[PDB]
Design a protein around this nucleic acid. Sequence first.
DNA 1: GTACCTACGGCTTATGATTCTTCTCGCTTCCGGCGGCATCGGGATGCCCGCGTTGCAGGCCA
DNA 2: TGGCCTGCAACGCGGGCATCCCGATGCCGCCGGAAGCGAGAAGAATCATAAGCCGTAG
Lengths: 306, 49
Amino acid sequence: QEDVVVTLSHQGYVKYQPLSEYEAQRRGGKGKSAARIKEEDFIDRLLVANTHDHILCFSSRGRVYSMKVYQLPEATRGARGRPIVNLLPLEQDERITAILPVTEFEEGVKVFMATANGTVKKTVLTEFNRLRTAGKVAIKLVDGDELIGVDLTSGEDEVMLFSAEGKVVRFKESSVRAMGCNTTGVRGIRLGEGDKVVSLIVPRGDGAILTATQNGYGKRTAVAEYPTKSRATKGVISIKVTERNGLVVGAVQVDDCDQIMMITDAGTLVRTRVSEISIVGRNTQGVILIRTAEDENVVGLQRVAE
Amino acid sequence: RDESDKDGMRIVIEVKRDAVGEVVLNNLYSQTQLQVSFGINMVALHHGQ
DNA sequence: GTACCTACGGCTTATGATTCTTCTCGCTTCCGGCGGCATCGGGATGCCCGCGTTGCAGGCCA
DNA sequence: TGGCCTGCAACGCGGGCATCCCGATGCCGCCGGAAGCGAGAAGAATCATAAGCCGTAG
């Protein structure tokens, strides 16, 4: 069993180490001398599971990879680990989208996916029983499409799709019927000309939804205000888009005690506590979070898993 | 090849270049008669039966 | 001087059949974008006042 | 042994209020693009059938 934690870095280094060693190394505060390095590396994804469980590596090209936990490099024989591109048969410009730990192949657990062209899809976990490290096709992507969000949905859970034009849709997964692995899928969100899906959030708990724009402007909004409409219908107001804001970068559910990660096109990394952001409604623009020049913009928003 | 003599049986097999040989050895163990089962069955007469 | 046949019983291996995985034809119809116009809520810009940010120095903590 | 956290006084500017302009938005008419369900086709696999050897017997 040996409960371990798997930490994927931003540069693509995958590794795992036991929970006792991880909690022992976590004791204490991070040195401020390392925070002055603008070209450092931080943890991108964190998960805790059993060494005998299976993981599903989802790529942007619609392919899914299945492999065991003990096949990854351990904490010994190397501290930083090994690149994920050297252990998984990934093609050129094929980045990992999401990784979902799976303990038991339950029939009631579904693997919900979402593409950039608004096409969403869910697949029964039973069909993912026997898959080797070579992987297979998980979704059929049209020319110009890519996989951007994968999450496990079951029971009466809901899904949310975010756009760059300020639209957002929220509908239950009961209005969708599962299909085969080699099919296209269903449609979930209205997308305008040139607009695409930027993020996905499944409502779990009472965490607030934190969004941001290109010019470093964001806000927070509770989930109790977001209406529950039908699938592929018109989206409710998520954020007031303005030439001062730009396209929506992304949105991630965050609590009142976690952090957020904001990166720009130059490479500036800014860590900002969520307590410094005012809480406003839906049909609002937000407040000033970070400075922005006339030639740069925020290109990525992510919640710190630390 | 073969190198058996009066000092012990010796069989020599040349491994193809650029081959691990362990996968080939496992394939042999799975296919070659070097791995065979055995039908244990203890039946005899106790009082002629 | 030498060769070729089967019965007594069990596991396997050398090849034609059936359920599970997969490859992808058909278009058409309810449905999903797509554009234009009136509408409305936000906010940027300006002024006032007190609170959020920061420097200094001390006691506490990894 | 060195650095993070915090009390305190002085410097600083942003939050709060008022308001007209702007861009998202709902609605309505109009155009288009996956879809998905059923159906047809392809590959993968486990059950069923004919001896071969073991050593005596004819």
